[model samples]
Target: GVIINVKCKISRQCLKPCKDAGMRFGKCMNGKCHCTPK
Candidate 1:
């Protein structure tokens, strides 16, 4: 997994979008949604 096209201001903002993108988890980093497989 990697950073998605979605922009996020907070860690929680990335959760749903990442899951929708088929990632296990996600966090906000550098103003973007960074996704991880585990």
Candidate 2:
């Protein structure tokens, strides 16, 4: 869906699990945290 939300980091500070369904982790691009598959 390419949903861009809020700011996040690589740490566990994110409430969202950046590796599951409808979740992921990616590098910063254009001052935003992009995400994808694990």
Candidate 3:
């Protein structure tokens, strides 16, 4: 799990990018895009 991108305004904004990066799930936290497996 890691931060996929920065300055994400919503959790949905991170989902597509995270999935494309091979991550299972994604969320926006502290304006950053975080990804996790399972």
Candidate 4:
């Protein structure tokens, strides 16, 4: 696992697919997509 900032370069492209899974901008972390833990 890795830690990344939302403001890093390529953030948008790295987070592109998450939009389809109901995730919005500013909520992605480490270039990986995650949902709220239940």
Worst 10 contiguous positions by lDDT, candidate 2: 8-17
Q: Rate the local accuracy (lDDT) of all candidates.
A: 0.77, 0.48, 0.78, 0.43
Alpha-carbon error at 6 in model 2, in Å? 2.8
Selected candidate, larger TM-score, 2 vs 3: 3
TM-score-better candidate, 2 vs 4: 2
Residue-level lDDT tens digits of model 2 in 1-38? 24346465433333255544454655444545565655
Note the residue pairs that clash in candidate 1: none
lDDT of 1: 0.77
Worst-scoring 10-residue span by lDDT in model 1: 12-21
Top-TM-score structure, candidate number: 3
**Candidate number with greatest lDDT:** 3
Q: Per-residue alpha-carbon lDDT of model 1 for 1-38, expressed as tens digits?
A: 67876778777778776777677888887787888865
Q: List RMSD in Å for every model shown.
A: 1.9, 3.8, 1.7, 6.3
What would the TM-score be for candidate 1 when compared with the true structure? 0.59
lDDT of 3 by residue, 1-38 (tens): 78865778887778887787787888888887888864
- Residue 2, candidate 1: C-alpha displacement in angstroms: 2.3
The parts of candidate 4 lying over 4 Å away from their true place are 1-9, 26-38
Write candidate 4's Cα lDDT for 11-33 as tens digits.
56534544544445524455543
Off by over 4 Å in 2: 1-3, 8-16, 20-25
| Candidate 4 local distance difference test against the native | 0.43
